[PDB]
Amino acid sequence: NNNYSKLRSMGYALTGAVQTLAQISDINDQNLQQGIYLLRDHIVTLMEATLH
Amino acid sequence: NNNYSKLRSMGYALTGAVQTLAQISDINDQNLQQGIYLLRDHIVTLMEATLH
Amino acid sequence: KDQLERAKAELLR
């Protein structure tokens, strides 16, 4: 119950949240980019044949 | 003006920012996903008719 | 959410 101790403990928790939030943000952004790339590739493949 | 008090007050502010940032990130990601889904649905609907 | 809640719990005492 030291005045510094229950502050050090909260300092421990106040950084894993930031780290995990960054990780989830990166995962979401990468998934969105991959989906967009797959969609554009399929669209181009479909688009060539009708022109020909 | 207690040495712990003006630290507790800053600890108060140093978490709502993280919470709101997470909320805004989720909102943006969901909006992007919904837009992509709407675009792909419309593209598929347009794509079937020209093939037929 | 639990981490932020514990952060807010580690200050009311």
- Which are the contacts of C3, defined by CB distance < 8 A and separation ≥ 6? A13, A14, A16, A17, A20
Q: Select the residue of A6, A17, A20 nearest C13 (Cβ to Cβ).
A: A6
Residues of C in contact with B8 (CB under 8 A): 11
Residue (of B20, A5, B42) closest to C4 by Cα position: B20
Residue B50: which of A18, A32, A50 has the nearest Cβ? A50
Resolution (angstroms) equals: 3.1
Task: Name the phi and psi angles at C12, rounded to 5.
Answer: -75, -10
Of A9, A13, A4, A17, the closest CA to residue B7 belongs to: A4
